[PDB]
Amino acid sequence: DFHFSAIFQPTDPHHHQTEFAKVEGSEKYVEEVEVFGRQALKVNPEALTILAHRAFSDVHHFFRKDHLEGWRRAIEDPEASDNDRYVATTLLKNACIAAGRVLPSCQDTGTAIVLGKRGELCWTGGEDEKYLSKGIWNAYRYHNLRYSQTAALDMFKECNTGDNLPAQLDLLAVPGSDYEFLFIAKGGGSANKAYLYQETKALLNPKSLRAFIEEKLKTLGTAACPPYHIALVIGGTSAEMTMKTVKLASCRYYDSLPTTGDKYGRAFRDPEWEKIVMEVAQKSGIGAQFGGKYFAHQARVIRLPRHGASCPVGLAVSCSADRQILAHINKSGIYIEQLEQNPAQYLPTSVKVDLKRPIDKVRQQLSQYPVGTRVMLNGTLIVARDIAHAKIKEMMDNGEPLPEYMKTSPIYYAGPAKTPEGYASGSFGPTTAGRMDSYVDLFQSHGGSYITLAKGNRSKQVTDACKKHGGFYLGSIGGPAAILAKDSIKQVTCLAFPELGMEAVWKIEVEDFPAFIVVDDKGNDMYSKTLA
């Protein structure tokens, strides 16, 4: 006999476990009505603008408790490494600055993502996408965020949209008369660490699955600013469904799923394998970016049904800029998840490197120290990331020289957020180093980029280049964009390619900028043991 079984059966489908605050006066935007014997809700679409604007404002300055608790755990655990505690303390101090509501917690203010669930009898006028986009537009235009979206004019010619649009707007049709939301400000680097694997029944045994988990976690590396919220999804009805599920799992959206399966194929959370993921993450030694125990805050594992011939697997993380906010509109008005507004309640040597010298003198100083040495940089940095590197490679391919500004100073891979009025800099933390790996040997062979400064582990070609050319890769702490801007960056100037927006080449003057020597000029790599 026919029995309908929804794949996802949360015990808390409306997220009653979350605390919400009502937007004052927002009941003027809604009206409960009764039509053809059923209860319905008229929603002024301006409510969607108001809600999206506040969601994408609040989320850049505050965090959830389970995120902040993880940083406290890394500081207080006796088994945490010194580097575990240093990174966690830095990230918590960064959250305190961001809670001042001026600087966003990260320079990568992310892609704006909206999961919306509009009830059958929730009536907005139907222009939901436009009104939500206006609210997102408002948040990024009138606050000190960043325009990160890149439009394709043709296959290869690109320009910044200049407003952080388009958003990802996933609006679902559901029962009832309410409007429920999950807003995500998703960083590009953590988005890049969403992986899809096409596996088989041969994986579905304890030995093979455990070895698989050990192998894939290492490929996450430190490139998305751990401690991670790690999500793993085994199975699914399609690749895109698997990847949607792992995204939502990483946002703890599916925390109230059942923990057992049944003959109808319902999804379930697997706490036993969540513990195994956490054990793998801790035993890996990767740590909170620079070696140790706190590779991961927590883990989510969801098992899904599958076609007999198929076994898609999804792996994804939420990064240090863990940014999601639940919301709903009902007959009483607009409700938005309440985040932690006082992160300070969770708070319980190094080599000085003078950059105001010839670069060869800086290289000589750095050559005296092994990888893992903590350094403090003082002086000028030249800032360049993906598009600038690509344009410079193209210039050299056309016979033009490597520009002088790539040869005078360490290269900081970064793209700043907008500068608050009266501030020297907006949030200005590092870009993932690995995306520039294909340029290092070329630029060094042409006399520049001997010293780079960014975050994340890099490929072997960069280790080989630095040894061949006498170069160095310095790893900044990943994530603390606001405290770096507040305490370290003293002057910012646009140097080249101003049309690239945040991806322009910048010249900045810094003081007390912390980093680790990750790759030296001798073939050594701080990550060679943990990420082998």
Q: Which residues fall in the annotated binding site for [4Fe-4S] cluster?
A: 106, 225, 319
Instruction: Lay out the site mask for Fe ion across 147-186 (x = CB under 5 A, - = otherwise).
Output: ----------------------------------------
**Peptide bond just before 227 cis, omega within 30 deg:** yes
Looking at residues 422 to 441 of the shown chain, list those that interact with Fe ion (rule: CB under 5 A).
432
User: In terms of CB distance, is 151 or 344 closer to its own copies?
Assistant: 151
The SS3 call for residue 300 is strand
Among 12, 240, 360, 511, the residue binding its own copies under the rule CB under 8 A is: 240
Q: With contacts defined by CB under 8 A, name the span among 22-30, 73-81, 266-274, 475-483 that binds its own copies.
A: 266-274
Interface with Fe ion includes 187 (CB under 5 A)?
A: no
The contacts of residue 268 (CB under 8 Å, 6+ apart) are 257, 258, 259, 260, 261, 302, 303
Nearest to 133 by CA among 76, 106, 171, 95: 171
How many Å apart are CA 230 and CA 278, to the nearest integer?
9
Q: Smallest distance, Å, CB 90 to its own copies? A: 21
Number of residues binding to its own copies, judged by CB under 8 A:
119
- Which H helix or E strand runs over 217? helix 206-220
How many Å apart are CA 180 and CA 175, to the nearest integer?
11
Interface with its own copies includes 175 (CB under 8 A)?
A: yes
How many Å apart are CA 45 and CA 25, to the nearest integer?
15
Among 176, 189, 235, 314, the residue binding Fe ion under the rule CB under 5 A is: 189
Interface with its own copies includes 176 (CB under 8 A)?
A: yes
Report DSSP state, residue 389.
H
Residue 60 binds which entry of its own copies, ligand F3S, Fe ion, none, with Cβ cut-offs from 5 to 8 Å by kind?
none
How many Å apart are CA 301 and CA 297, to the nearest integer?
14
Interface with its own copies includes 420 (CB under 8 A)?
A: no
Looking at residues 101 to 130 of the shown chain, list those that interact with Fe ion (rule: CB under 5 A).
none
Number of residues binding to Fe ion, judged by CB under 5 A:
3
Residue 265 binds which entry of Fe ion, its own copies, ligand F3S, none, with Cβ cut-offs from 5 to 8 Å by kind?
its own copies
Among 124, 222, 318, 530, the residue binding its own copies under the rule CB under 8 A is: 124
Q: Smallest distance, Å, CB 476 to ligand F3S? A: 10
How many Å apart are CA 215 and CA 207, to the nearest integer?
13
Residue 253 binds which entry of ligand F3S, Fe ion, its own copies, none, with Cβ cut-offs from 5 to 8 Å by kind?
none
How many Å apart are CA 60 and CA 426, to the nearest integer?
13
Please state at what angle helix 46-58 crosses helix 128-142, rounded to 10 degrees: 40
Residue 479 binds which entry of its own copies, ligand F3S, Fe ion, none, with Cβ cut-offs from 5 to 8 Å by kind?
ligand F3S
In the β-sheet with 228-234, what is the strand arrangement from edge to edge?
A: 194-199, 311-318, 228-234, 296-303, 268-269
Residue pair 7/265 in contact (Cβ under 8 Å)? The answer is: yes
Which residues bind to ligand F3S, rule: CB under 6 A?
Answer: 106, 108, 110, 187, 189-190, 224-225, 319-321, 429, 478-479
Annotated binding site: 106-108, 146, 189, 192-198, 225, 319, 385, 431-435, 455
Q: Smallest distance, Å, CB 113 to ligand F3S? A: 13
Structure tokens at 405: 């500004």
Instruction: Lay out the site mask for its own copies across 134-153 (x = CB under 8 A, - = otherwise).
Output: x--x---x------xxxxxx
Looking at residues 179 to 198 of the shown chain, list those that interact with its own copies (rule: CB under 8 A).
186-189, 191-196, 198
Q: Smallest distance, Å, CB 487 to its own copies? A: 24
Nearest to 109 by CA among 56, 66, 156, 73: 56
Q: Smallest distance, Å, CB 255 to its own copies? A: 18
Among 192, 256, 378, 459, the residue binding Fe ion under the rule CB under 5 A is: 192
Distances (CA, A) of 139 to 4, 78, 188, 366: 42, 41, 18, 42
